[PDB]
Amino acid sequence: PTQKELRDTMSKKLQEAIKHPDPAVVAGRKSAIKRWVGVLQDNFMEHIKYFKGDKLKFLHNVFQDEGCWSGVRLDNAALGQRFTEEKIGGIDNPLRKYEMACSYCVVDKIHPLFQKRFESYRNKFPPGAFDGKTETEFGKYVRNSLLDSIKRKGPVFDFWIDRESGELKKYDAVEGFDSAVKFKWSEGVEYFYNHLKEEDKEKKLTEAILALSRVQSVEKDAPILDFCVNKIVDKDTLLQKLSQKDKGVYSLFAELIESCFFDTVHDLVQCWCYKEGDHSEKIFSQRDYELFLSSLSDTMLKNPELSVQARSLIMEFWECGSLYQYRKAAVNTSNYTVPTSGVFAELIVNWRREDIYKTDEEKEIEKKEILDMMSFAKDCFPEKFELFKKLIIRDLRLCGREGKRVNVDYGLFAEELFSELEK
């Protein structure tokens, strides 16, 4: 397989650890595991790629531990403790412990774990005195050589150890926070956030959100945006600042959706779009709206374990009263195209998906959602509905997407919905 397939395989394997009565909790924790492994790029995959047997079992047992979770998000303080232990439940820790202590800001263990790394690294040099240097000179030389080597894997692994003295470095909370944002180091952002003075927290969170909410955003930005948005106390002031930034609101929603932070997007739609001057003021554009829906339906197919939650957010955008104008324009056919043809096609693909068991009740809920959306398209533009139908069918036939069974005419499934609609 490709590296992407190996990451998806590793995520799916670690997701076997997740069991919980609440389906939203299961889905959210499974998405958290996928972000921890890495989706489009390696995150912790780099450390665990070749783990099998007891090495994988150690990770399984960590993610099975209810103490490692805060709702649907990983509890980094608890994870850091587990990932720096020598053994848990009779299984040796397979991870590079100094690197885990750095990443999770386990400040009581970074220095002693680095000393063990330093002592073994020193063992590749001759056992005597080296080049007549003093012990301090030689210790500074080996430590610098070791840290210069480790820093290739990321600035976090050369952040905590003083080059001159070898001691654990101390950071002011603002300096650490800014460095962690620069490093796209989500664990460090949270660690230093907890050390900011109360009067500084809102300003620093807002700075981070405005800096990262841009079309240049990448996957490692999303956990930082999610963390910062959920720590903001005054969401109305945040919107005022973000709406002054070019594509700021679009970029925030888009990055959160693509990384499956669905609960956060739900919360922001409620705060910013379902809130009750100009009653019809918009905070994102018609095209932004269509891109939210298309991103959600694409994420739904890529992550079927989240399909219920993705559909919920699609319907939140669809039925939001302040967005009714966008909803209508989203089903308007013009120049032989309709903005939501792919969304409808992907909802149909999801509805007909059979690789995971779903009850007849869940299938009927999915079907009714689709029929209700199609009925709206027909009611808005009855004279264009025949073209609308053709475009959905063509979109189903033109794309071979995830979750779509090969050599199956999905257009026939669309025709079944269309037929029920007329009668």
Coordinates of C-alpha atoms in Angstrom, one line a residue:
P1 CA 0.0 0.0 0.0
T2 CA 0.8 3.7 -0.2
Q3 CA 1.8 5.7 2.9
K4 CA -1.8 7.2 2.9
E5 CA -3.3 3.7 2.9
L6 CA -0.9 2.6 5.7
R7 CA -2.0 5.6 7.8
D8 CA -5.6 4.8 7.2
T9 CA -5.0 1.2 8.1
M10 CA -3.2 2.2 11.3
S11 CA -6.0 4.7 12.2
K12 CA -8.7 2.0 11.6
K13 CA -6.7 -0.4 13.8
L14 CA -6.4 2.0 16.7
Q15 CA -10.1 2.9 16.3
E16 CA -10.8 -0.7 17.5
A17 CA -10.0 0.7 21.0
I18 CA -13.1 2.9 21.0
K19 CA -16.3 1.7 22.6
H20 CA -19.0 4.0 24.2
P21 CA -22.8 4.0 24.6
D22 CA -23.1 7.4 22.9
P23 CA -22.7 7.2 19.1
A24 CA -21.6 10.8 18.9
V25 CA -18.8 10.0 21.4
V26 CA -17.7 7.0 19.4
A27 CA -17.6 9.0 16.2
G28 CA -15.8 11.9 17.7
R29 CA -13.2 9.7 19.4
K30 CA -12.6 7.8 16.2
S31 CA -12.0 11.0 14.4
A32 CA -9.6 12.1 17.2
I33 CA -7.6 8.9 16.6
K34 CA -7.4 9.6 12.9
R35 CA -6.1 13.1 13.6
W36 CA -3.5 11.7 16.0
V37 CA -2.2 9.2 13.4
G38 CA -2.4 11.8 10.6
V39 CA -4.7 11.9 7.6
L40 CA -3.1 13.8 4.6
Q41 CA 0.3 13.8 6.4
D42 CA 2.0 11.8 9.1
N43 CA 1.3 13.0 12.6
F44 CA 2.2 10.4 15.1
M45 CA 2.3 7.8 12.3
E46 CA 6.0 8.6 12.1
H47 CA 6.6 7.1 15.5
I48 CA 4.3 4.0 15.3
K49 CA 4.5 3.0 11.6
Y50 CA 6.0 -0.5 12.1
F51 CA 4.4 -1.4 15.4
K52 CA 2.8 -4.9 15.7
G53 CA 2.0 -7.3 18.5
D54 CA 2.6 -5.9 22.0
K55 CA 3.8 -2.6 20.6
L56 CA 0.4 -2.0 19.0
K57 CA -1.4 -3.4 22.1
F58 CA 0.3 -0.8 24.3
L59 CA -1.3 1.9 22.1
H60 CA -4.7 0.1 22.0
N61 CA -4.8 0.0 25.8
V62 CA -3.9 3.7 26.1
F63 CA -6.8 4.7 23.8
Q64 CA -9.1 2.3 25.6
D65 CA -8.4 4.1 28.9
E66 CA -11.3 6.4 29.7
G67 CA -8.9 8.7 31.6
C68 CA -7.2 9.6 28.3
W69 CA -10.3 11.3 26.9
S70 CA -12.1 14.6 27.6
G71 CA -15.3 14.0 25.8
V72 CA -14.4 13.3 22.2
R73 CA -10.9 14.9 22.4
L74 CA -7.7 13.4 23.7
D75 CA -6.7 14.5 27.2
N76 CA -3.1 15.5 26.5
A77 CA -2.0 15.7 30.1
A78 CA -3.2 12.1 30.6
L79 CA -1.7 10.9 27.3
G80 CA 1.6 12.5 28.1
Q81 CA 1.8 10.5 31.4
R82 CA 0.9 7.2 29.7
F83 CA 3.3 7.7 26.8
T84 CA 6.3 8.4 29.2
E85 CA 5.7 5.4 31.5
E86 CA 8.1 2.5 31.4
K87 CA 5.3 -0.1 31.2
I88 CA 1.6 -0.3 31.6
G89 CA -0.5 -3.3 32.4
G90 CA 2.6 -5.6 32.0
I91 CA 3.4 -4.2 28.5
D92 CA 6.6 -2.3 27.9
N93 CA 6.2 1.2 26.4
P94 CA 7.5 0.9 22.8
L95 CA 7.7 4.7 22.1
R96 CA 10.7 7.0 22.1
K97 CA 10.0 8.4 25.5
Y98 CA 12.1 11.6 25.4
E99 CA 10.3 12.5 22.2
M100 CA 6.9 11.8 23.7
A101 CA 7.8 13.9 26.8
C102 CA 8.7 16.8 24.5
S103 CA 5.6 16.6 22.4
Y104 CA 3.3 16.3 25.4
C105 CA 5.2 18.8 27.6
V106 CA 5.8 16.3 30.4
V107 CA 8.2 18.7 32.0
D108 CA 9.1 16.5 35.0
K109 CA 10.4 13.8 32.7
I110 CA 11.9 15.6 29.8
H111 CA 15.3 16.0 31.5
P112 CA 15.8 12.5 32.9
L113 CA 14.6 10.9 29.7
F114 CA 17.0 13.1 27.7
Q115 CA 19.8 12.0 30.1
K116 CA 19.2 8.3 29.2
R117 CA 19.2 9.2 25.5
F118 CA 22.4 11.3 26.0
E119 CA 24.2 8.4 27.8
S120 CA 23.4 5.8 25.1
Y121 CA 24.3 8.3 22.3
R122 CA 27.6 9.0 24.1
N123 CA 28.4 5.3 23.9
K124 CA 29.2 5.5 20.2
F125 CA 32.2 7.7 21.0
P126 CA 35.4 6.1 22.5
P127 CA 35.1 5.1 26.2
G128 CA 38.0 7.3 27.3
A129 CA 38.4 11.0 27.2
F130 CA 37.7 12.4 23.7
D131 CA 40.3 14.6 22.0
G132 CA 41.6 15.8 25.4
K133 CA 38.5 17.9 26.0
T134 CA 37.2 18.5 29.5
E135 CA 34.2 16.7 30.7
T136 CA 32.1 19.9 30.4
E137 CA 33.4 20.5 26.9
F138 CA 32.7 16.9 25.9
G139 CA 29.2 16.9 27.4
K140 CA 28.3 20.1 25.6
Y141 CA 29.7 18.6 22.3
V142 CA 27.8 15.3 22.6
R143 CA 24.6 17.1 23.7
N144 CA 24.7 19.5 20.8
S145 CA 25.5 16.8 18.3
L146 CA 22.5 14.7 19.7
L147 CA 20.1 17.7 19.6
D148 CA 21.3 18.8 16.1
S149 CA 20.4 15.2 15.0
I150 CA 17.0 15.1 16.7
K151 CA 15.9 18.5 15.5
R152 CA 15.5 17.1 11.9
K153 CA 12.3 15.5 13.2
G154 CA 10.8 18.9 14.4
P155 CA 11.6 22.0 16.5
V156 CA 9.7 20.4 19.4
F157 CA 12.6 18.0 20.0
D158 CA 15.2 20.8 20.4
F159 CA 12.9 23.1 22.4
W160 CA 13.2 22.0 26.0
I161 CA 17.0 21.3 26.5
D162 CA 19.4 24.2 27.1
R163 CA 22.3 23.8 24.6
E164 CA 24.8 25.4 27.0
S165 CA 23.9 23.8 30.4
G166 CA 21.9 20.8 29.4
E167 CA 19.2 21.9 31.8
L168 CA 15.4 22.0 31.3
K169 CA 14.5 25.3 29.7
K170 CA 11.8 27.5 31.2
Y171 CA 9.5 29.5 29.0
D172 CA 7.2 32.4 29.8
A173 CA 3.7 31.5 28.8
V174 CA 3.3 34.0 26.0
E175 CA 6.7 33.0 24.4
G176 CA 5.8 29.3 24.6
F177 CA 2.3 29.9 23.2
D178 CA 3.6 31.9 20.3
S179 CA 6.3 29.3 19.5
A180 CA 3.8 26.4 19.7
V181 CA 1.5 28.3 17.3
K182 CA 4.4 28.8 15.0
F183 CA 5.4 25.1 15.2
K184 CA 1.7 24.1 14.6
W185 CA 2.2 22.2 17.9
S186 CA -1.3 21.7 19.3
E187 CA -0.2 20.0 22.5
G188 CA 2.2 22.9 23.2
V189 CA -0.5 25.5 22.4
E190 CA -2.7 23.9 25.1
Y191 CA 0.1 23.5 27.5
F192 CA 1.1 27.2 27.4
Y193 CA -2.5 28.4 27.1
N194 CA -3.0 26.9 30.6
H195 CA -0.1 29.0 31.9
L196 CA -1.2 32.4 30.4
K197 CA -2.5 35.0 32.8
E198 CA -6.3 35.2 32.7
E199 CA -6.1 38.8 31.3
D200 CA -4.0 37.6 28.4
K201 CA -5.9 34.5 27.3
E202 CA -8.5 36.1 25.0
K203 CA -6.0 38.3 23.1
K204 CA -3.7 35.3 22.5
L205 CA -6.5 33.0 21.4
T206 CA -7.8 35.6 19.0
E207 CA -4.3 36.3 17.6
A208 CA -4.0 32.5 16.9
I209 CA -7.4 32.2 15.3
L210 CA -6.9 35.2 13.0
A211 CA -3.5 34.0 12.0
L212 CA -4.5 30.5 11.1
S213 CA -7.9 31.2 9.5
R214 CA -6.7 31.7 6.0
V215 CA -6.9 29.9 2.7
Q216 CA -3.3 28.8 3.2
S217 CA -4.4 26.6 6.2
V218 CA -3.2 23.0 6.4
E219 CA -4.3 20.0 8.4
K220 CA -2.0 20.7 11.4
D221 CA -3.7 24.1 11.8
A222 CA -7.2 22.6 12.5
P223 CA -6.6 21.2 16.1
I224 CA -5.2 24.6 17.1
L225 CA -8.2 26.5 15.6
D226 CA -10.6 24.0 17.3
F227 CA -8.8 24.4 20.7
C228 CA -8.7 28.2 20.5
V229 CA -12.3 28.6 19.4
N230 CA -13.6 26.4 22.2
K231 CA -11.7 28.4 24.8
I232 CA -13.0 31.8 23.5
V233 CA -15.5 33.3 26.0
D234 CA -16.9 36.1 23.8
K235 CA -17.8 34.5 20.4
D236 CA -19.5 37.7 19.3
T237 CA -16.3 39.8 19.6
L238 CA -14.4 37.0 17.8
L239 CA -16.8 37.2 14.9
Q240 CA -16.4 41.0 14.6
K241 CA -12.6 40.5 14.4
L242 CA -12.6 37.5 12.1
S243 CA -15.2 39.0 9.7
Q244 CA -12.7 41.9 9.0
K245 CA -10.2 39.3 7.6
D246 CA -10.4 38.3 4.0
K247 CA -12.1 34.8 3.9
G248 CA -11.5 34.5 7.6
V249 CA -14.9 33.0 8.5
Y250 CA -14.9 30.8 5.5
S251 CA -11.4 29.6 6.3
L252 CA -12.2 28.8 9.9
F253 CA -15.3 26.7 9.0
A254 CA -13.6 25.0 6.1
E255 CA -10.6 23.9 8.0
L256 CA -12.7 22.6 10.9
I257 CA -15.1 20.7 8.6
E258 CA -12.2 19.1 6.7
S259 CA -10.7 17.9 9.9
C260 CA -14.0 16.6 11.3
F261 CA -14.4 19.1 14.1
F262 CA -18.2 18.9 13.6
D263 CA -19.3 19.8 17.1
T264 CA -17.3 23.0 16.9
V265 CA -18.8 24.0 13.6
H266 CA -22.3 23.2 15.0
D267 CA -21.6 25.5 17.9
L268 CA -20.4 28.3 15.6
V269 CA -23.4 28.0 13.3
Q270 CA -25.6 28.3 16.4
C271 CA -23.7 31.3 17.7
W272 CA -23.2 33.1 14.5
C273 CA -26.0 32.0 12.0
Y274 CA -29.0 31.0 14.2
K275 CA -28.7 34.1 16.4
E276 CA -31.7 36.3 16.1
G277 CA -30.4 46.6 12.0
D278 CA -30.0 44.4 8.9
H279 CA -31.6 41.1 10.0
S280 CA -30.2 39.3 6.9
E281 CA -26.5 40.2 7.4
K282 CA -24.3 37.4 6.0
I283 CA -20.9 36.4 7.4
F284 CA -19.9 34.2 4.4
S285 CA -20.8 34.1 0.8
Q286 CA -23.0 32.0 -1.5
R287 CA -20.0 30.2 -2.8
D288 CA -18.6 29.6 0.7
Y289 CA -22.0 28.0 1.6
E290 CA -21.8 25.6 -1.3
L291 CA -18.2 24.7 -0.4
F292 CA -19.3 23.9 3.2
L293 CA -21.9 21.5 1.9
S294 CA -19.6 19.9 -0.7
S295 CA -16.8 19.5 1.9
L296 CA -19.2 17.9 4.4
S297 CA -20.5 15.4 1.8
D298 CA -17.0 14.5 0.7
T299 CA -15.9 14.1 4.4
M300 CA -19.0 11.9 4.9
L301 CA -17.8 9.5 2.2
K302 CA -14.2 9.5 3.3
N303 CA -15.1 8.8 7.0
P304 CA -18.3 6.6 7.1
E305 CA -18.0 6.3 10.8
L306 CA -18.9 10.0 11.0
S307 CA -21.7 9.9 8.4
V308 CA -24.5 10.6 10.9
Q309 CA -22.7 13.6 12.3
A310 CA -21.7 15.0 8.9
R311 CA -25.4 14.7 7.7
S312 CA -26.5 16.5 10.9
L313 CA -24.2 19.4 10.0
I314 CA -25.3 19.4 6.4
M315 CA -28.9 19.7 7.6
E316 CA -27.9 22.4 10.1
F317 CA -26.6 24.6 7.2
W318 CA -29.5 23.6 5.0
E319 CA -32.3 24.5 7.4
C320 CA -30.7 27.5 9.0
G321 CA -33.4 30.3 8.6
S322 CA -30.8 33.0 8.0
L323 CA -29.3 31.0 5.1
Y324 CA -32.6 30.2 3.3
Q325 CA -31.6 32.5 0.4
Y326 CA -28.3 30.5 0.0
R327 CA -30.2 27.2 0.2
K328 CA -32.5 28.2 -2.7
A329 CA -29.6 29.5 -4.9
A330 CA -27.8 26.2 -4.1
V331 CA -30.5 24.3 -6.0
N332 CA -30.9 26.7 -8.9
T333 CA -29.8 25.2 -12.2
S334 CA -28.0 27.5 -14.6
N335 CA -25.7 26.9 -17.6
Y336 CA -26.4 23.2 -17.3
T337 CA -25.0 23.1 -13.8
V338 CA -26.4 23.1 -10.2
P339 CA -24.1 23.9 -7.3
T340 CA -25.3 21.0 -5.2
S341 CA -25.3 18.1 -7.8
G342 CA -22.3 16.5 -6.1
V343 CA -23.8 16.9 -2.6
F344 CA -27.0 15.1 -3.7
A345 CA -24.9 12.4 -5.5
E346 CA -22.8 11.8 -2.4
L347 CA -25.8 11.7 -0.1
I348 CA -27.2 9.0 -2.4
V349 CA -23.9 7.1 -2.3
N350 CA -24.0 7.2 1.5
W351 CA -27.6 6.1 1.6
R352 CA -26.8 3.1 -0.5
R353 CA -23.5 2.2 1.3
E354 CA -23.4 -1.4 2.5
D355 CA -19.9 -1.9 3.8
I356 CA -21.0 -1.2 7.4
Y357 CA -24.2 -2.5 8.9
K358 CA -27.0 0.0 9.4
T359 CA -30.5 -0.6 10.6
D360 CA -33.5 -0.2 8.3
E361 CA -34.5 2.7 10.5
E362 CA -31.2 4.6 9.8
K363 CA -31.5 3.9 6.0
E364 CA -35.1 5.3 6.0
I365 CA -33.9 8.5 7.8
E366 CA -31.2 9.0 5.2
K367 CA -33.7 8.4 2.4
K368 CA -36.3 10.9 3.8
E369 CA -33.5 13.5 4.1
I370 CA -32.7 13.2 0.5
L371 CA -36.3 13.2 -0.6
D372 CA -37.0 16.4 1.4
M373 CA -34.0 18.1 -0.2
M374 CA -35.1 17.0 -3.7
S375 CA -38.7 18.2 -2.9
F376 CA -37.3 21.6 -2.1
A377 CA -35.4 21.8 -5.3
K378 CA -38.5 20.9 -7.2
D379 CA -40.7 23.4 -5.3
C380 CA -38.2 26.2 -5.8
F381 CA -37.8 25.8 -9.6
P382 CA -40.4 23.4 -11.0
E383 CA -39.6 24.3 -14.6
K384 CA -35.9 23.3 -14.1
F385 CA -36.4 20.1 -12.1
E386 CA -36.1 17.8 -15.1
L387 CA -32.7 19.2 -15.8
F388 CA -31.9 19.1 -12.1
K389 CA -32.6 15.3 -12.1
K390 CA -30.4 14.7 -15.1
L391 CA -27.5 16.5 -13.5
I392 CA -27.7 14.4 -10.2
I393 CA -27.7 11.2 -12.3
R394 CA -24.8 12.4 -14.4
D395 CA -22.8 13.4 -11.3
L396 CA -23.4 9.9 -9.9
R397 CA -22.2 8.3 -13.1
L398 CA -19.2 10.6 -13.8
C399 CA -17.3 10.1 -10.5
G400 CA -15.9 7.0 -9.0
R401 CA -15.8 8.2 -5.3
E402 CA -15.1 6.5 -2.0
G403 CA -17.9 4.3 -0.8
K404 CA -19.3 3.7 -4.3
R405 CA -19.5 0.1 -5.4
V406 CA -17.8 -0.5 -8.7
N407 CA -19.8 -1.5 -11.8
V408 CA -23.1 -0.5 -10.1
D409 CA -25.4 2.0 -11.8
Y410 CA -26.2 4.4 -8.9
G411 CA -28.3 6.4 -11.3
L412 CA -31.0 3.8 -10.9
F413 CA -31.1 4.6 -7.1
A414 CA -31.6 8.2 -8.0
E415 CA -34.4 7.3 -10.4
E416 CA -36.1 5.4 -7.5
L417 CA -36.1 8.6 -5.4
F418 CA -37.2 10.7 -8.3
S419 CA -40.1 8.3 -9.1
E420 CA -41.4 8.3 -5.5
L421 CA -41.3 12.1 -5.7
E422 CA -43.7 12.4 -8.6
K423 CA -46.2 10.0 -7.0

